[PDB]
Design a protein around this nucleic acid. Structure first.
Ligand SMILES: Nc1ncnc2c1ncn2[C@@H]1O[C@H](COP(=O)(O)OP(=O)(O)O)[C@@H](O)[C@H]1O
Ligand SMILES: Nc1ncnc2c1ncn2[C@@H]1O[C@H](COP(=O)(O)OP(=O)(O)O)[C@@H](O)[C@H]1O
Ligand code: BEF
Ligand code: BEF
Ligand SMILES: [Mg+2]
Ligand SMILES: [Mg+2]
Lengths: 457, 456
RNA sequence: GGACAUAUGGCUGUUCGCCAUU
RNA sequence: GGACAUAUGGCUGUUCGCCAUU
């Protein structure tokens, strides 16, 4: 029985949904912010990473959704496409209590035409990045006239110098009589002081100070820039993390580190803005489901990404801003878990390490370099099958699991994460059984119908 | 220089284009119909199958294309989606003489929004099936206001009872002052009499009578309906055709025969209207490049499809109309080749065999069934599907360059390369297919990384 | 018969389905 | 720096590019 019932607002169908979903206890940010949000107040919330802010504003805006009114009623803004799809994915699971709730994602990298076609049936909720959404607004394919709530996730990033104009351009399409929710784990005083420009009489709910991190152990290594890649390979050999995210400050360094890790057999993929959007999506799928051991990324992955039970974060180079460092290490130690965050520091980056030390009021644990120089390989335990169809073909996870376990004859313990995307379904299978599964499912049948299956790298 | 120079009309760049393409001699329909078309006249043409009608109307409409004018100036209508894409494929090859010529296909099975997106830059030429084109016309995403030429390939099918309404609906968007070209190998007089409704004082160029077939040998077998599938398996085991098209009259029989052929190990794919369009496209790709030995199809493949050096056509059931029989067997013996067409005849279908006998002025060569065991038919190739296509600026040379250079493949192990709008299909011999797929998966084409799937 | 065509979404992790109207 | 964004096409089967204006 869920503790969310103590709010005395949510309908019984939502309480049953939360019980089936496993939301049995409210996190602090949920307990502190949901009553005000459900009452229609504007809020600015500050809570640490991985503490459930998504459901905090998601349960809030869902309470004011009328499924019979086929117009857009809630809008969520995110700084990155992968985060936007993730937030929309969790909103959909929270919206199960309300049948026929259409939640649409509007991001770049997708062709404009398919979004225009989907927008003829106006979605109740839009989760979007500012760029593609503004395009749709200017061409009259999206209307905000029926907007009840506007949410800005990672709101200090959405209000910075880079996003302010695009955010301002979007808000002129929004009604003034709206609930505006701003959520983030970090709030620079400059950004927080001006944050009222997009709100009406907001309540400040600052339950975690900026130095109140999740349980993250931090280690720091002195190294020249030239020694970073050899050090990283040796540290990954020492810790042997089940999953690891390595952060770089440039797209060039990001791809270079990924290629260096794959050259020594340490299963790595890259995630940055010069990749094709399909590769960005498939890389995140394969890293999350265990088809890759290490993810090398720029700050496109610094915020909000919720990779389950991430063991290790490595700062190949310290971020330009200390707030970004907080978001990076926040990729681990989520939802009550602990984590380890290693940071490399060249002499030019010493001052950024000092700024992080002051802001977080932590003592840097400088480590002595490893005793062994041996570089071991890291093989990924899973491989990803990509089946054509997705939600358009009404292929649900039970169909994939049923087909894989039946005539194709696989053990249910050999199948990991199943992710249903709009046009594809991704399945994780143990590496040893992946090739047989691919060939047998290619000439088999799923849901009575024939399928097209790909085996990803 | 190519004999096309004797037309004294084509620009020099097109004469060079024809020589590089291998069009060194004009076919009869090209030699007989192109002067009138290049002079701007409406024509109704009757020429046998596989004798070059596409270039006949393709060179015609391209002569009146203004590349600086970014409006639709030529429209080609086809009865099937695969034929429309095929006709556009050869039009692009013929349009190399004119840089920056946009030829777009408008067919069903493709998402509407992506087509709307492409239509912001209006294409010079549209090749389309009537259904999806009319949708675009009614929604104002396509304009025929600047149309110079209108082509109806397989014009006798486009003017029949099933298409008449939609064709009229399309023509309502076209100018009356237009060149209208009608091509087909078959012309029922009833359809030919009403064909003038869409033309302006047309020239009739009927160089092949309906019985003037390409060199196609025909054999006929008496058989029960129950004995058809075992006979087919035995005939394919005897003949071992490198490629074969088996025609059925229903979508159910089409899939049933395909599955029975695969049960005895005779590499077969199916092509019919109940398939997803992606399956239809990939089936035609894999059959055309040798990744399957037998193609089982309904009459969706009866007309216009140009499969190179197709060895055998089998009529599992005789078509309802004799003209469709002409188009079916016309899938073989193309562009000067010979071919074999076997037909099965159940007692209920004897009447259809006689009608074919009269129309084609042939005496039926009835065969006695094979003395015979059922053998396997292995596909010699496998198809790699690379993501990108023309959207990613991938030209066939890039794929071949990556396969032969870094990945280290023999150039003689790579067959047909087909650049589609979003994908590139490559045929490689099955013995090397898995190695090619895996190494191209972790390799790079054109400097950039690729994501490669193996269809099989 | 065969073509042409066939909107947009919601729904249990052992499939072959069940719903909504835009 | 990193996000957001990044139109539509043409180019001769041994790639890593070259062009057009919408
Ligand atoms: N009340 C809850 N009970 C159990 N799990 C939760 C609860 N709220 C959130 N979670 C899960 O914990 C993780 C926290 O994710 P997220 O909301 O992205 O944190 P934040 O946005 O604050 O960084 C998510 O995987 C979410 O599904
Ligand atoms: N003048 C020519 N010289 C050589 N080959 C040609 C010539 N014209 C056409 N071809 C080829 O011959 C085949 C005839 O195809 P197609 O035009 O579809 O015939 P039809 O439309 O008359 O059935 C095609 O593969 C085409 O590329
Ligand atoms: F702060 Be959470 F990681 F969005
Ligand atoms: F008449 Be051809 F086969 F198009
Ligand atoms: Mg979040
Ligand atoms: Mg033709």
């Amino acid at each position: 029985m869920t503790a969310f019932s103590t709010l005395n607002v949510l309908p019984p169908a939502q309480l049953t949904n939360l019980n089936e979903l496993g939301y049995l206890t409210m996190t602090p940010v949920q307990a502190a912010a949901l009553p005000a949000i459900l009452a229609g107040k504007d809020v600015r919330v500050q809570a640490k990473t991985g503490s459930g802010k998504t459901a905090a504003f998601g349960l809030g805006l869902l309470q004011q959704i009328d499924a019979s009114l086929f117009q857009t009623q809630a809008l969520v803004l995110c700084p990155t496409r992968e985060l936007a799809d993730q937030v929309a994915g969790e909103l959909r699971r929270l919206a199960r209590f309300l049948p026929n709730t259409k939640i649409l994602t509007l991001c770049g990298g997708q062709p404009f035409g398919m979004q225009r076609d989907s927008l003829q049936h106006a979605p109740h909720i839009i989760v979007a990045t500012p760029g593609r959404l503004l395009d749709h607004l200017q061409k009259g394919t999206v209307s905000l006239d029926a907007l009840n709530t506007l949410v800005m996730d990672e709101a200090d990033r959405m209000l910075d110098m880079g996003f302010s104009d695009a955010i301002d351009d979007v808000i002129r399409f929004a009604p003034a009589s709206r609930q505006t929710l701003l959520f983030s784990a970090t709030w620079p005083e400059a950004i927080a002081a001006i944050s009222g420009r997009v709100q009406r009489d907001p309540l400040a709910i600052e339950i975690d100070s900026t130095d109140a991190l999740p349980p993250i152990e931090q280690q720091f290594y002195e190294t020249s820039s030239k020694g970073k890649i050899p050090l990283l390979q040796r540290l990954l050999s020492l810790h042997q993390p089940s999953s690891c995210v390595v952060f770089c400050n440039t797209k060039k360094d990001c791809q270079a580190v990924c290629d260096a890790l794959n050259e020594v057999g340490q299963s790595a993929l890259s995630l940055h803005g010069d990749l094709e959007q399909r590769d960005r999506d498939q890389t995140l799928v394969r890293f999350a489901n265990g088809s890759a051991r290490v993810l090398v990324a720029t700050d496109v992955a610094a915020r909000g990404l919720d990779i389950k039970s991430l063991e290790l974060v490595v700062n190949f180079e310290l971020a330009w801003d200390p707030e970004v460092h907080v978001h990076r290490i926040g990729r681990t130690a989520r939802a009550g878990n602990s984590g380890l965050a290693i940071s490399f520091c060249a002499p030019e980056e010493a001052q950024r390490a000092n700024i992080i030390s002051d802001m977080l009021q932590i003592k840097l644990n400088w480590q002595t370099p490893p005793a062994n120089s041996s570089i071991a390989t890291l093989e990924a335990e899973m491989a990803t099958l990509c089946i054509d169809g997705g939600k358009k073909a009404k292929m649900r996870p039970g169909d994939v699991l049923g087909a894989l376990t039946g005539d194709i004859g696989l053990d249910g313990a050999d199948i990991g994460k199943i992710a249903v995307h709009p046009a594809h379904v991704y399945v994780a299978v143990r590496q040893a059984v992946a090739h047989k599964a691919w060939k047998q499912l290619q000439g088999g049948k799923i849901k009575g119908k024939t399928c097209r299956v790909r085996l990803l790298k």
